[PDB]
Design an enzyme around this catalytic site. Sequence first.
Site, PDB file in Angstrom:
ATOM      1  N   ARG A 141      -8.597  42.227 -10.597  1.00 39.12           N
ATOM      2  CA  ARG A 141      -7.485  41.264 -11.101  1.00 39.12           C
ATOM      3  C   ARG A 141      -7.819  39.976 -10.688  1.00 39.12           C
ATOM      4  O   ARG A 141      -7.737  39.055 -11.705  1.00 39.12           O
ATOM      5  CB  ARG A 141      -6.307  41.750 -10.538  1.00 39.12           C
ATOM      6  CG  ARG A 141      -6.113  41.791  -9.096  1.00 39.12           C
ATOM      7  CD  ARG A 141      -4.845  42.612  -8.718  1.00 39.12           C
ATOM      8  NE  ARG A 141      -4.868  43.090  -7.332  1.00 39.12           N
ATOM      9  CZ  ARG A 141      -5.230  42.679  -6.132  1.00 39.12           C
ATOM     10  NH1 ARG A 141      -5.928  41.403  -5.997  1.00 39.12           N
ATOM     11  NH2 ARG A 141      -5.185  43.318  -5.097  1.00 39.12           N
ATOM     12  N   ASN A 142      -8.348  39.628  -9.499  1.00 40.09           N
ATOM     13  CA  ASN A 142      -8.839  38.191  -9.367  1.00 40.09           C
ATOM     14  C   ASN A 142      -9.984  37.749  -9.819  1.00 40.09           C
ATOM     15  O   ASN A 142     -10.719  36.890  -9.462  1.00 40.09           O
ATOM     16  CB  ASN A 142      -8.829  38.097  -7.786  1.00 40.09           C
ATOM     17  CG  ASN A 142      -7.180  38.301  -7.311  1.00 40.09           C
ATOM     18  OD1 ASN A 142      -6.436  38.133  -7.787  1.00 40.09           O
ATOM     19  ND2 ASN A 142      -7.160  38.819  -5.945  1.00 40.09           N
ATOM     20  N   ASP A 155      -7.795  32.874  -6.917  1.00 45.72           N
ATOM     21  CA  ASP A 155      -6.951  33.420  -6.238  1.00 45.72           C
ATOM     22  C   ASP A 155      -7.357  33.572  -4.660  1.00 45.72           C
ATOM     23  O   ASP A 155      -7.498  34.550  -4.207  1.00 45.72           O
ATOM     24  CB  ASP A 155      -6.308  35.003  -6.376  1.00 45.72           C
ATOM     25  CG  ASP A 155      -5.096  35.025  -5.470  1.00 45.72           C
ATOM     26  OD1 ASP A 155      -4.099  34.861  -6.019  1.00 45.72           O
ATOM     27  OD2 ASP A 155      -5.365  35.840  -4.703  1.00 45.72           O
TER      28      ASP A 155
HETATM   29  C1  LIG Z   1      -5.386  35.935 -10.851  1.00 45.72           C
HETATM   30  O1  LIG Z   1      -5.378  34.945 -11.813  1.00 45.72           O
HETATM   31  C2  LIG Z   1      -5.182  33.739 -11.308  1.00 45.72           C
HETATM   32  C3  LIG Z   1      -5.143  33.528 -10.010  1.00 45.72           C
HETATM   33  C4  LIG Z   1      -4.998  32.134  -9.547  1.00 45.72           C
HETATM   34  C5  LIG Z   1      -5.005  31.183 -10.391  1.00 45.72           C
HETATM   35  C6  LIG Z   1      -4.790  29.774 -10.293  1.00 45.72           C
HETATM   36  C7  LIG Z   1      -4.954  28.702 -10.807  1.00 45.72           C
HETATM   37  C8  LIG Z   1      -4.725  27.699 -10.160  1.00 45.72           C
HETATM   38  C9  LIG Z   1      -4.776  28.020  -9.000  1.00 45.72           C
HETATM   39  O2  LIG Z   1      -4.829  29.379  -9.013  1.00 45.72           O
HETATM   40  C10 LIG Z   1      -5.366  31.382 -11.849  1.00 45.72           C
HETATM   41  C11 LIG Z   1      -5.666  32.728 -12.396  1.00 45.72           C
HETATM   42  N1  LIG Z   1      -5.730  33.096 -13.428  1.00 45.72           N
HETATM   43  C12 LIG Z   1      -6.425  32.239 -14.416  1.00 45.72           C
HETATM   44  N2  LIG Z   1      -6.847  31.089 -14.229  1.00 45.72           N
HETATM   45  C13 LIG Z   1      -7.725  30.234 -15.243  1.00 45.72           C
HETATM   46  N3  LIG Z   1      -8.010  30.907 -16.196  1.00 45.72           N
HETATM   47  C14 LIG Z   1      -7.400  32.104 -16.616  1.00 45.72           C
HETATM   48  N4  LIG Z   1      -7.478  33.027 -17.644  1.00 45.72           N
HETATM   49  N5  LIG Z   1      -6.839  33.882 -17.406  1.00 45.72           N
HETATM   50  C15 LIG Z   1      -6.166  34.137 -16.085  1.00 45.72           C
HETATM   51  C16 LIG Z   1      -5.447  34.934 -15.889  1.00 45.72           C
HETATM   52  C17 LIG Z   1      -5.005  35.816 -16.629  1.00 45.72           C
HETATM   53  C18 LIG Z   1      -4.357  36.732 -15.775  1.00 45.72           C
HETATM   54  C19 LIG Z   1      -4.441  36.310 -14.557  1.00 45.72           C
HETATM   55  O3  LIG Z   1      -4.926  35.144 -14.576  1.00 45.72           O
HETATM   56  C20 LIG Z   1      -6.744  32.864 -15.600  1.00 45.72           C
END
Ligand SMILES: COc1ccc(-c2ccco2)cc1Nc1ncnc2[nH]nc(-c3ccco3)c12
Length: 299
Positions: A141-142, A155
């Site tokens: 997931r991360n 994450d």
């Molecule tokens: C677990 O996913 C994350 C966990 C942390 C961050 C995050 C963004 C800024 C600080 O932490 C951002 C994301 N996700 C993301 N960060 C950049 N582009 C992304 N496209 N799609 C996602 C995404 C889809 C589902 C969960 O995240 C995503």
Amino acid sequence: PNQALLRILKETEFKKIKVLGSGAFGTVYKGLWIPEGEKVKIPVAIKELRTSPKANKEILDEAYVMASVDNPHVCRLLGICLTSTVQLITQLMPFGCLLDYVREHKDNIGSQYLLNWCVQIAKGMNYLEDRRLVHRDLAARNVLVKTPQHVKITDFGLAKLLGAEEKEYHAEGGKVPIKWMALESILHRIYTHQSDVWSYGVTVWELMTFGSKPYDGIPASEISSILEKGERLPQPPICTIDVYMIMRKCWMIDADSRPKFRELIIEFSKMARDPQRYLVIQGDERMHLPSPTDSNFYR
Ligand SMILES: COc1ccc(-c2ccco2)cc1Nc1ncnc2[nH]nc(-c3ccco3)c12
């Protein structure tokens, strides 16, 4: 001298289009950033852990870790906005999470894409190992998808930093996925890079099962028991005995006997030279067409 730096961004420059998803331990928003002078729009993702001083300090160290790493296999924080709460801002990955992706396109992803992903995850994990830090939460997931040929890691809300003589870390309390934890981490709350090797093996198990839930019927508490029994996760269908050997060596008892991420890069890259030898997929000859097929694609 590579030292961290945080660029503060104005709230008047963010136009939160919508939300992205609420993970079982986080909430993320979709956004499109416009600098005050560049007049160019860039897609971004915004994390807002919502209000306590314990989670506030958690965002602090998380942002510190995310604003210091620099690798094409590790998604990097680009700034922090200051609103009522603290906003973390990274570059938005169009195709999104990898777990939900391999669950969506399992009948279109070939053996070549799976091994290269494992190569890329090992490279990023090996980079953050050279920067002396443990992820403590490596799951499918991360892992995100910049392009179907390139993945990244995010994450860092549980990542920690190792000191000079420090080669390990002791956790404060629980609240850890456990299914991705090593047995030594479940027992004594100890985290190393070899514990990240274990979680890496669980991630690869997730990718090779096209998104299956590890220890599904197990009610979490039974994990430490079956680990002490000697059994691990079963062998995936597409995986030969060679790939299952690599994953099993990431899950053995002694932490020092687990493979470092350097030799994991060498092994999966050697397997990436001949994908048909180590993964048996019914199709393989067929390929997915990404970007015309919108699916998960937004400005
Ligand atoms: C677990 O996913 C994350 C966990 C942390 C961050 C995050 C963004 C800024 C600080 O932490 C951002 C994301 N996700 C993301 N960060 C950049 N582009 C992304 N496209 N799609 C996602 C995404 C889809 C589902 C969960 O995240 C995503």
